[PDB]
Design a protein around this ligand. Structure first.
Ligand SMILES: [Mn+2]
Ligand SMILES: [Mn+2]
Ligand SMILES: [Zn+2]
Ligand SMILES: [Zn+2]
Ligand SMILES: [Zn+2]
Ligand SMILES: [Zn+2]
Lengths: 162, 162
DNA sequence: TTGACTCTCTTAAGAGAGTCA
DNA sequence: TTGACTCTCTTAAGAGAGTCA
């Protein structure tokens, strides 16, 4: 098994490589009518992506390193969390984009949490709009708002009460 | 079926059958430390379910009627909305449980909206905790709260900024 | 050891359609 | 005509593993 020192070395090489990705400045809603700025380190749209990186899906990548003749591979956003527990409350931990930008690999824009917690950030009002996430959101979720409901609750007769 | 009269007859037959489902009272968080009461009309756990109803999955049912000697079949929660547009902004419209209770078929607990709007209600603070849904929530979403994040954003070196 | 592709899978909110009696 | 089963699919947040040079 990889030692803690070897895992730390993997995280360090990953950080070195991701740190050289193009850094893109994005202005984002924070909630409460306020605007903030995030700096995303974005993996390229097409090969080559960077040393150790390869695309396994339209918005999916993996990181690969060969140690003592054994090939090791990880989901490209999971590497910052290799020294953390990988489940909680019986749920698998997932890499969760606080910036809601899939191509971004900035570890300051990622957290490690259940898929339900991950998804829910899409609708959060944001750090200046009432976010209650213990690990605070960096921005208002992209899907926050009144929604676009086509039809609401309704009945033709009198068979029901709310 | 095709005619508006035939569709109204389908909606009326569905309402009459679901109106005879057992009515189960559920006390629910509203947000803001307040509690409310919902009356769900719950499809039975096992056959028989009611005239026209059959189970296609653990928590999935369909409604079927024979019109003009042809069988017409719908997802069991879609029937109230048969006169509504079936898409919005190029996204499929879905039946969305305001009571977060799959077995419930009370149309006063259903709305018709994109899958994204639908999902997002799971994390809504609720009608007394800040819900901004234009078609208002009936309760706080079951997944609202601080979450259980295992690890937050972090870096080992000095290559990244927020 | 490395790059650039290939494939299928998970989850939890939702769907359509066929086989028998 | 009606009932009670069977199967796979959609979406958008996420995954693991194979092949070839
Ligand atoms: Mn996410
Ligand atoms: Mn729902
Ligand atoms: Zn980012
Ligand atoms: Zn938040
Ligand atoms: Zn209900
Ligand atoms: Zn709401």
């Amino acid at each position: 098994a990889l030692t803690n020192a070897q895992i730390l070395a993997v995280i360090d090489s990953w950080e070195e490589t991701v740190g050289q990705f193009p850094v893109i400045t994005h202005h984002v809603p924070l909630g409460g009518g306020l605007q903030g700025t995030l700096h995303c380190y974005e993996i390229p749209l097409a090969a080559p992506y960077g040393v150790g990186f390869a695309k396994n899906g339209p918005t999916r990548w993996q990181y690969k390193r060969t140690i003592n003749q054994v090939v090791h591979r990880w989901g490209s956003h999971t590497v910052p969390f290799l020294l953390e527990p990988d489940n909680i409350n019986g749920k698998t931990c997932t890499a969760s984009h606080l910036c809601h930008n899939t191509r971004c690999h900035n570890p300051l824009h990622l957290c490690w949490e259940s898929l339900d917690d991950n998804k829910g950030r899409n609708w959060c009002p944001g750090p200046n709009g009432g976010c209650v996430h213990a690990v605070v959101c960096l921005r208002q979720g992209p899907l926050y708002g009144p929604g676009a409901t086509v039809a609401g609750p309704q009945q033709r007769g009198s068979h029901f009460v709310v």
